[PDB]
């Protein structure tokens, strides 16, 4: 199976520098033309440099040169970019990106965030959305765990480590006006479960290396 | 450089539908290098076309590229709700290998109303100086909705942010969360918190409320 597995992103101080790296393969990485695409929150995608299959040409972004290198290790492959003199609008996420000539549509990496801030990694504070006769109709309850102010992006939240599943609703987190993001994440079950099931939700927030368990427990009357 | 501009900007058609994406060029592209990515929300764009009219990998029929020169389309020939998406064409001849501004794909569906939760702050929070009161409008469709809050019925602006979610894969509707953020002291000023939803799919405007500290 294709695989590009793109590291090194993340958090960094404005004029710093990162060093991005992707693992590919699956398909003859060594024969190919390679990318990285960029794309800032909420924005398109802009290609930022590219690479001939033997390392001997290489193109870029006027907004990039002189200060990012795109470069390959055929060996292992794999594909990297040199990131520095870093500013806001660097901010965004990478993908490694194969020339589209190899006509394999799974044929870029993940993306890695990159966050140009001067600001610190803050793990959030996870709270209970609490089941209530104002969020349960029918057969089935809401409930919810509130992900608060963390930075920088991105956290995953799971239920009961991933066994649940439909129903379940991880909202885009919001940027607040104190430079924290906050998120919700709910589900809905059914009401007899109440008093059974547990519901748990699970937070990890890698770059503040937080991790926290909330249990989520129901209002009865 | 080539400049790529997409039309349109937005698409909203049902299942069963054709879509027709178009991609124009400023100068002719060389070897129709040309290729179409699928952007879902959030995830890593898959390439459908390469060579303006060939499909990668894994691509279904009812995607298909044509063109040349400097006009290229992308049609999904029949619609399936998992289609929803923003679509970029790419030209790959000569460096920058500029992409387009996208077109975003909405599928369109009857008309379904929200079901309305609200959730007053945890006693957790509560005990850090801060009151989040949320309002979950679920499983709706159009996109377009209004949510009012009201405290003690006097109504808030300035206090709240929304999120939506992406369309679900199957039904094609939208989920989306109101956070109203008051001061611990601020939320105990007063009693009734009242979320007030408009929306199509209402024959009238429903609101959920609770007063400050019942079960
Ligand atoms: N300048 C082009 C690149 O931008 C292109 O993607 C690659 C494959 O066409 O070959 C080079 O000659
Ligand atoms: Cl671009």
């Known amino acids: 199976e294709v695989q590009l597995v793109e590291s090194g992103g993340g958090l960094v101080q404005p004029g710093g520098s990162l060093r991005l790296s992707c693992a590919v393969s699956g398909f003859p990485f060594s024969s190919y033309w390679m990318s990285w695409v960029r794309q800032a929150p909420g924005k398109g995608l802009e290609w930022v440099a590219n690479?001939?299959?033997?390392?001997?040409?290489?193109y870029y972004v006027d907004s990039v040169k002189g200060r990012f290198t795109i470069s390959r290790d055929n060996a292992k492959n794999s594909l990297y970019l040199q990131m520095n003199s870093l500013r806001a609008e660097d901010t965004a996420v990478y993908y490694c990106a194969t020339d589209p000539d190899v006509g394999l549509s799974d044929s870029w990496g993940q993306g890695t965030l990159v966050t140009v801030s001067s600001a610190s990694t803050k793990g959030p504070s996870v709270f209970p959305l609490a089941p209530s006769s104002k969020s349960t109709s029918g057969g089935t309850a809401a409930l919810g765990c509130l992900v608060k102010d963390y930075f920088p992006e991105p956290v995953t939240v799971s239920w009961n480590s991933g066994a649940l599943t439909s129903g379940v609703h991880t909202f885009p987190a919001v940027l607040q006006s104190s430079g924290l993001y906050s998120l919700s994440s709910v589900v809905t079950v059914p009401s007899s479960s109440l008093g059974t099931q547990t519901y748990i939700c699970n937070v990890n927030h890698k770059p503040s290396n937080t991790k926290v368990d909330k249990k989520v427990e129901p209002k009865s009357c | 450089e080539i400049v790529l501009t997409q039309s349109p900007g937005t698409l909203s058609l049902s299942p069963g539908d054709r879509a027709t994406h178009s991609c124009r060029a400023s100068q002719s592209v060389s070897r129709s290098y040309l290729a179409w990515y699928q952007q879902k929300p959030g995830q890593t764009p898959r390439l459908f076309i390469y060579?303006?009219?060939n499909r990668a990998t894994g691509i279904p029929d009812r995607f298909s590229g044509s063109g040349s020169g400097t006009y290229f389309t992308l049609t999904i020939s029949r619609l399936e709700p998992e289609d929803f998406a923003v679509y970029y064409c790419q030209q790959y001849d000569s460096a920058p290998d500029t992409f387009g501004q996208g077109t975003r794909l909405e599928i369109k569906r009857t008309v379904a109303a929200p079901s309305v939760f609200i959730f007053p702050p945890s006693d957790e929070q509560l005990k850090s100086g801060t009151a989040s009161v949320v309002c979950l409008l679920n499983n709706f469709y159009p996109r377009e909705a209004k949510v009012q809050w009201k405290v003690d019925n006097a109504l808030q602006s300035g206090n709240s942010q929304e999120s939506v979610t992406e369309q679900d894969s199957k039904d094609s509707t939208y989920s989306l969360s109101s956070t109203l953020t008051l001061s611990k002291a601020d939320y105990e000023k007063h009693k009734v918190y009242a979320c007030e939803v408009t929306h199509q799919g209402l024959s009238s405007p429903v609101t959920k409320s609770f007063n400050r500290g019942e079960c």
């Open positions: 690479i001939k299959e033997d390392g001997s040409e290489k």
């Open positions: 060579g303006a009219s």
